[PDB]
């Protein structure tokens, strides 16, 4: 689709239209501090094209916003390559938010979820997070309306054993949380329950097909999900493959190469040879 940069959206909602054609945000997305906004600015607004965030997602003090079901309906993976504190999703002092509605979110690789101080917010205990996050031990969901034992939560849907009882799992009144059979793992499945291809991540339009993933599990290159970037391609942003040329062009006006990865910085013990961008170990001590 489109790959755009990590963005930081504040004050006027109008900045939000930068994302219109975007499919993957390479980096993080932060939408915050909007105090004059009203429900009606959101009841006609959507980003069905956003499928993936590489780093983290953070919503904070966005008023008038009541569900995310129309805003990011098709966001499916958050990869958490870089985290906010230790979180890959932060929902914080989101006054007005009632329900989450990320019914397409299937996996948060790496990070944890922190959803705090959201009076109004329910449909939280109706989510099985362990089907989405690797580590839920570090989840931090407190001080929401859900913690008043007094939530009008209603959903068909399936139940998991999180307590000492099974619990129906859904995002909104009209969307179930999708659960793939245990043995599909993270790879996703069709509505019937045929596992997607093993190099796919959350979902697929067709089964058994590495070009028909909705979000690559390992790395993306030339339409296909692959296990690893072959030379002459390099690991970038830890989700996609690129050639030397791409990596170089970005460096010049601070990207470098090491371990067959294209990265901002040489790691310790290494200095950057100028002829080839390749990090080399130091002759004696490293000035760096």
């Amino acid at each position: 689709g489109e790959v755009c940069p990590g963005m930081d959206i504040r004050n006027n909602l109008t900045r939000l239209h930068e994302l219109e054609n975007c499919s993957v945000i390479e980096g993080h997305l932060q939408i915050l501090l909007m105090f004059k906004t009203r429900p009606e600015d959101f009841r006609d607004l959507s980003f069905p094209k956003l499928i993936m965030i590489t780093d983290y997602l953070l919503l904070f003090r966005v008023y008038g916003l009541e569900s995310l079901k129309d805003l990011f309906p098709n966001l499916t993976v958050i990869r958490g390559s870089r985290l906010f504190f230790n979180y890959a999703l932060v929902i914080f002092e989101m006054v007005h938010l009632k329900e989450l509605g990320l019914y397409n979110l299937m996996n948060i690789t790496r990070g944890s979820v922190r959803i705090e101080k959201n009076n109004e917010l329910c449909y939280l205990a109706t989510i099985d997070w362990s089907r989405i996050l690797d580590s839920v031990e570090d989840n931090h969901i407190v001080l929401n309306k859900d913690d008043n034992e007094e939530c009008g939560d209603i959903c068909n849907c399936p139940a998991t054993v999180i307590n000492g009882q099974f619990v129906e799992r859904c995002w909104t009144h009209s969307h179930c949380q999708k659960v793939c059979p245990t043995i599909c793992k993270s790879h996703g499945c069709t509505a019937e329950g045929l596992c997607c291809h093993s190099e796919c991540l959350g979902n697929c339009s067709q089964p058994d097909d590495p070009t028909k993933c909705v979000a690559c599990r390992n790395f993306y290159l030339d339409g296909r999900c692959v296990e690893t970037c072959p030379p002459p391609y390099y690991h970038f942003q830890d989700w996609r493959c690129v050639n030397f040329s791409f990596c170089q062009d970005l460096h010049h006006k601070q990207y470098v190469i090491h371990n067959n990865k294209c990265i901002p910085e040489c790691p310790s013990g290494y200095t950057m040879n100028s002829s080839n961008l390749l990090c080399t170990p130091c002759l004696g001590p490293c000035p760096k």
């Binding site: 690893t228 970037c229 690991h235 371990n259 067959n260 990865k261």
Partner: peptide, 9 residues
């Protein structure tokens, strides 16, 4: 041996 994944090609 590929460094980036520890597999031989």
């Amino acid at each position: 041996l590929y460094s980036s994944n520890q597999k031989n090609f």
